[PDB]
Structure 1
Amino acid sequence: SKGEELFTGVVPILVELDGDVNGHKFSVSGEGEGDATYGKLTLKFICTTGKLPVPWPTLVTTLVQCFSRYPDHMKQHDFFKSAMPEGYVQERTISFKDDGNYKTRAEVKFEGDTLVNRIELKGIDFKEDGNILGHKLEYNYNSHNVYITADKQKNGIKANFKIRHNIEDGSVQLADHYQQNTPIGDGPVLLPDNHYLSTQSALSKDPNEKRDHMVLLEFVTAAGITHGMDELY
């Protein structure tokens, strides 16, 4: 697709999130860049309202899959870039096992030459001292696959996946993700065969930053589609 042309180099990224979890209101602003050639994201997020009322790892998935590296042989399956520059709406339900849920709505689009992710997050039915509001989740992140399928009726896609958040006692907090993406513009998009995004995420801190924040290095690579290239060798 035509949109893929927008991603051949380093693209600046801005992320802005407004959240309410159990009446705890907060905002996050992120800045960095993406280079889809390497499936690579480098971002720093700051909670601009004070202390973040949920653990940072629980927000990683909400906080630009247009930066995934789609191998050449699978580029006809890249919905995300094909919707650019007009963008897409991304909605999720994130169900924390034995606890509350996030509902998110985002618009991901270009503003000039910057890729912007604007998000509203609503969390309900969290337990006062469960793993989320009780801050019992380690500051780390496990690799996962995002399983994508076409939704041709909506001219878009759906995804399903499980995030496993490590609890500080050695256990796991499951976060089931259900996702839908639909284009903002009316131009044609790519509707993919089933495949997945292999995602690896590393969380860190800026040693000179006093605000509540998260430094993220993430690699995202599309996979899962059959090719006959081995025959070439």
Structure 2
Amino acid sequence: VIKEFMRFKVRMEGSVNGHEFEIEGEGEGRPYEGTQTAKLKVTKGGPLPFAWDILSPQFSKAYVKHPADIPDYLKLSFPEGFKWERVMNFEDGGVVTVTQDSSLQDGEFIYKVKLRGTNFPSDGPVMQKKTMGWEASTERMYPGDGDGDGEAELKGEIKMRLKLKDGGHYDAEVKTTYMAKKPVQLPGAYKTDIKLDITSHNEDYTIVEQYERAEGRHS
């Protein structure tokens, strides 16, 4: 059901420091090559009064290139799909919590995202729009119980670093649990190398295009 070229549609509803917004977008990519693009539009609550960069990692793990000897748990979960739940703890106390549902309908992936950002300092780089994209990251994957049923799901941990417009960096610690909707084979521990670029945007980041390349490899 996962072809060599796949499209997706995404909707996000969120709030950051109480500012509510909605985003609708579409994407496409090559799931076995690990590459994908997305075009997002802010349909309500724009222009966003905070940095786009805290949203960009929430817009697609079916598109991670995996070697044949690492089970591709998230690809195997389809057509039913999977859910994920993420916490990002930023170094100045801001927090982003995300929940997401991924399914396959009419030959396309369907993503539904709910996001809540809290406690960003009013004078910090997120609320002041002083960020300039993510450095490449490495997510460390491992099987572990993330939902209290006693059975392992797939967990990931990332140390992420955002570049600052005025010079410097700004760090976040991220934990995600990925949960298949049907029983499928979990891998052992491995790592995923990820690089996400904003490839174009209008001046106020209400229409934004992203590109991501992601590849799983042995530890």
Q: Tell whether 2:135 aligns with 1:142.
A: yes
- What is the aligned-residue RMSD (CA, Å)? 1.8
After TM superposition, the score normalised by the length of structure 2 is: 0.91
Offset, 1:143? 0.9
Amino acid at match of 2:84: Q
Distance 1:162 1:53 in 2: 25
Q: Larger helix proportion, structure 1 or 2?
A: 1
- Residue pair 1:136, 1:167 contacting (<8 A) in 2 also: yes
Q: Which runs of no fewer than 5 residues in structure 1 stay unpaired?
A: 1-5, 226-233
Amino acid at match of 1:215: E
Distance 1:123 1:73 in 2: 37
Residues 87, 135 of structure 1: alpha-carbon distance in 2 compared, 3 angstrom cutoff: same
Report Cα offsets for 1:58-107 as digits up to 9, x if no partner.
11211111110112232xx2111111111111001111111310111100
Amino acid at match of 1:173: Y
Alignment-derived partner of residue 174 in structure 2: 177
Alignment-derived partner of residue 33 in structure 1: 28
- Aligned-residue identity in percent: 23
Distance 1:9 1:15 in 2: 20
Distance 1:128 1:167 in 2: 16
Alignment-derived partner of residue 8 in structure 2: 13
Distance 2:188 2:140 in 1: 11
Q: Tell whether 2:200 aligns with 1:205.
A: yes
Amino acid at match of 1:142: E
Alignment-derived partner of residue 82 in structure 1: 76
Alignment-derived partner of residue 68 in structure 2: 72
- Residue pair 1:7, 1:35 contacting (<8 A) in 2 also: no
- Residue pair 2:89, 2:173 contacting (<8 A) in 1 also: yes
Amino acid at match of 1:176: E
Distance 1:151 1:81 in 2: 18
Offset, 1:204? 2.1
